Design an enzyme around this catalytic site. Sequence first.
Site, PDB file in Angstrom:
ATOM      1  N   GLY A  91      -0.472   2.880   3.506  1.00 46.50           N
ATOM      2  CA  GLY A  91      -0.029   1.602   4.032  1.00 46.50           C
ATOM      3  C   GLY A  91       0.332   0.572   2.972  1.00 46.50           C
ATOM      4  O   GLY A  91       0.687  -0.558   3.303  1.00 46.50           O
ATOM      5  N   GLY A  93       2.745   0.897   0.556  1.00 44.17           N
ATOM      6  CA  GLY A  93       4.178   0.861   0.304  1.00 44.17           C
ATOM      7  C   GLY A  93       4.795   2.018  -0.479  1.00 44.17           C
ATOM      8  O   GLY A  93       5.917   1.901  -0.993  1.00 44.17           O
ATOM      9  N   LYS A  94       4.084   3.140  -0.566  1.00 39.84           N
ATOM     10  CA  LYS A  94       4.604   4.308  -1.283  1.00 39.84           C
ATOM     11  C   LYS A  94       5.917   4.849  -0.696  1.00 39.84           C
ATOM     12  O   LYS A  94       6.897   5.056  -1.417  1.00 39.84           O
ATOM     13  CB  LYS A  94       3.566   5.421  -1.321  1.00 39.84           C
ATOM     14  CG  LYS A  94       2.327   5.094  -2.125  1.00 39.84           C
ATOM     15  CD  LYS A  94       1.416   6.316  -2.203  1.00 39.84           C
ATOM     16  CE  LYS A  94       0.924   6.730  -0.811  1.00 39.84           C
ATOM     17  NZ  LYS A  94       0.110   5.664  -0.176  1.00 39.84           N
ATOM     18  N   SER A  95       5.938   5.078   0.611  1.00 35.22           N
ATOM     19  CA  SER A  95       7.123   5.635   1.253  1.00 35.22           C
ATOM     20  C   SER A  95       8.260   4.623   1.345  1.00 35.22           C
ATOM     21  O   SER A  95       9.436   4.956   1.158  1.00 35.22           O
ATOM     22  CB  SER A  95       6.767   6.178   2.635  1.00 35.22           C
ATOM     23  OG  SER A  95       5.999   7.360   2.491  1.00 35.22           O
ATOM     24  N   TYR A  96       7.900   3.382   1.638  1.00 36.14           N
ATOM     25  CA  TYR A  96       8.863   2.301   1.652  1.00 36.14           C
ATOM     26  C   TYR A  96       9.593   2.201   0.307  1.00 36.14           C
ATOM     27  O   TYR A  96      10.795   1.935   0.262  1.00 36.14           O
ATOM     28  CB  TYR A  96       8.161   0.978   1.957  1.00 36.14           C
ATOM     29  CG  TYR A  96       9.114  -0.190   1.990  1.00 36.14           C
ATOM     30  CD1 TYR A  96       9.833  -0.486   3.145  1.00 36.14           C
ATOM     31  CD2 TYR A  96       9.305  -0.992   0.870  1.00 36.14           C
ATOM     32  CE1 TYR A  96      10.712  -1.545   3.191  1.00 36.14           C
ATOM     33  CE2 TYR A  96      10.200  -2.063   0.902  1.00 36.14           C
ATOM     34  CZ  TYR A  96      10.897  -2.329   2.075  1.00 36.14           C
ATOM     35  OH  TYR A  96      11.779  -3.381   2.149  1.00 36.14           O
ATOM     36  N   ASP A 216       6.275  11.088  -3.747  1.00 33.97           N
ATOM     37  CA  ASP A 216       5.518  10.219  -2.847  1.00 33.97           C
ATOM     38  C   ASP A 216       4.119  10.822  -2.742  1.00 33.97           C
ATOM     39  O   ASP A 216       3.913  11.807  -2.034  1.00 33.97           O
ATOM     40  CB  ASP A 216       6.217  10.145  -1.482  1.00 33.97           C
ATOM     41  CG  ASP A 216       5.549   9.162  -0.508  1.00 33.97           C
ATOM     42  OD1 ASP A 216       4.403   8.717  -0.759  1.00 33.97           O
ATOM     43  OD2 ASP A 216       6.174   8.852   0.532  1.00 33.97           O
ATOM     44  N   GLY A 219      -2.127   9.433  -0.177  1.00 32.42           N
ATOM     45  CA  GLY A 219      -2.891   8.200  -0.220  1.00 32.42           C
ATOM     46  C   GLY A 219      -4.138   8.313  -1.077  1.00 32.42           C
ATOM     47  O   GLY A 219      -4.809   9.341  -1.096  1.00 32.42           O
TER      48      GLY A 219
HETATM   49  N1  LIG Z   1       7.604  -4.160  -0.069  1.00 32.11           N
HETATM   50  C1  LIG Z   1       7.677  -4.050   1.284  1.00 32.11           C
HETATM   51  N2  LIG Z   1       8.444  -4.882   2.020  1.00 32.11           N
HETATM   52  C2  LIG Z   1       8.530  -4.779   3.359  1.00 32.11           C
HETATM   53  N3  LIG Z   1       7.868  -3.851   4.074  1.00 32.11           N
HETATM   54  C3  LIG Z   1       7.056  -2.954   3.458  1.00 32.11           C
HETATM   55  C4  LIG Z   1       6.915  -3.005   1.994  1.00 32.11           C
HETATM   56  N4  LIG Z   1       6.063  -2.021   1.648  1.00 32.11           N
HETATM   57  C5  LIG Z   1       5.700  -1.381   2.788  1.00 32.11           C
HETATM   58  N5  LIG Z   1       6.289  -1.944   3.867  1.00 32.11           N
HETATM   59  C6  LIG Z   1       6.106  -1.512   5.281  1.00 32.11           C
HETATM   60  O1  LIG Z   1       4.701  -1.393   5.549  1.00 32.11           O
HETATM   61  C7  LIG Z   1       4.412  -0.150   6.191  1.00 32.11           C
HETATM   62  C8  LIG Z   1       3.609   0.742   5.254  1.00 32.11           C
HETATM   63  O2  LIG Z   1       4.525   1.221   4.264  1.00 32.11           O
HETATM   64  P1  LIG Z   1       4.511   2.743   3.760  1.00 32.11           P
HETATM   65  O3  LIG Z   1       5.375   2.867   2.532  1.00 32.11           O
HETATM   66  O4  LIG Z   1       4.750   3.626   4.952  1.00 32.11           O
HETATM   67  O5  LIG Z   1       2.988   2.968   3.297  1.00 32.11           O
HETATM   68  P2  LIG Z   1       2.458   4.276   2.531  1.00 32.11           P
HETATM   69  O6  LIG Z   1       3.632   5.190   2.314  1.00 32.11           O
HETATM   70  O7  LIG Z   1       1.908   3.714   1.238  1.00 32.11           O
HETATM   71  O8  LIG Z   1       1.401   4.874   3.435  1.00 32.11           O
HETATM   72  C9  LIG Z   1       5.748   0.512   6.484  1.00 32.11           C
HETATM   73  O9  LIG Z   1       6.152   0.199   7.823  1.00 32.11           O
HETATM   74  C10 LIG Z   1       6.708  -0.139   5.515  1.00 32.11           C
HETATM   75  O10 LIG Z   1       8.014  -0.215   6.083  1.00 32.11           O
HETATM   76 MG   LIG Z   2       3.694   7.199   3.415  1.00 26.24          MG
END
Ligand SMILES: Nc1ncnc2c1ncn2[C@@H]1O[C@H](COP(=O)(O)OP(=O)(O)O)[C@@H](O)[C@H]1O
Ligand SMILES: [Mg+2]
Length: 302
Positions: A91, A93-96, A216, A219
């Site tokens: 959560g 922002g890794k995938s984002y 990616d 977690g």
């Molecule tokens: N820098 C950012 N700006 C806007 N939204 C973000 C950002 N980083 C993450 N998010 C959003 O927050 C949520 C968690 O991001 P995600 O990358 O899926 O987490 P992770 O991959 O680390 O588990 C997603 O819906 C993503 O779109």
């Molecule tokens: Mg992810």
Amino acid sequence: KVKVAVRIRPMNRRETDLHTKCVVDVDANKVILNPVQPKVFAYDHCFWSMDESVKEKYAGQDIVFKCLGENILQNAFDGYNACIFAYGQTGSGKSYTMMGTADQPGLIPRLCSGLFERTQKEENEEQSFKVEVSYMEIYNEKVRDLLDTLKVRPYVDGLSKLAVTSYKDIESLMSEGNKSRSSRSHAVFKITLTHTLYDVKSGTSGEKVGKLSLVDLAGSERATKTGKEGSNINKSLTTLGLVISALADQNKFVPYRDSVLTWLLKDSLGGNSKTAMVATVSPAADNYDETLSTLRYADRAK
Ligand SMILES: Nc1ncnc2c1ncn2[C@@H]1O[C@H](COP(=O)(O)OP(=O)(O)O)[C@@H](O)[C@H]1O
Ligand SMILES: [Mg+2]
């Protein structure tokens, strides 16, 4: 050699709704974790992405690619190897950051767009480019082909490696793989870029090969007991930590074989390879512990 960055995501909906306090401040390339004594860490870059309206310091997807992607891409055109890792809490922002959304494309789409733009610019009758992609998932030290369990022998026996000739092509595989895909495994998007130059008789007179591994990671959060995956993930991530640190310190010993991830990427970690790691973190008080842990991990690797 090794570049380490930290990206701070915005408050999510729940944190916003519930008025969770912000405990992460930034100062140029320093990150300050305020107590929920302040702790200060220094990195190669800090991407403060909490709020688009603060133009003075907001880092959008375009900024992340400019500071981490462009150089890595150039490196592959130079005929060298590179890895980019997104590391942090589920959560955070890794995938984002690595892949992004349809509206906010991340590192991987931008890099592939940049790649094909450049090859289509330089290609002609006397030089060609071959672009090959693999997309795999490492879960509990077992490998799965996201473009279809494969045995590790360093290669993945039967891992599809697909020739692509356009951005649209490489896009169908991003799309396909992401569907077939997650917070407890590593996803590895691999591009092989081969650039061949020909002599006057159409024989080969020059050739550079550049590999790009865009990762990616699973977690990093500690599981809480309320009555093993986390442990297996911890070993992998700890090993990746030791590898990156040791390379960053560059006769030293580098423990590639201690994990499937680090062994498979040995070719793009050693030698004259470049590694970039983005440590993603939440700004929020309710994530202090994991944020602190992520910061120390990132600090250690640097
Ligand atoms: N820098 C950012 N700006 C806007 N939204 C973000 C950002 N980083 C993450 N998010 C959003 O927050 C949520 C968690 O991001 P995600 O990358 O899926 O987490 P992770 O991959 O680390 O588990 C997603 O819906 C993503 O779109
Ligand atoms: Mg992810």
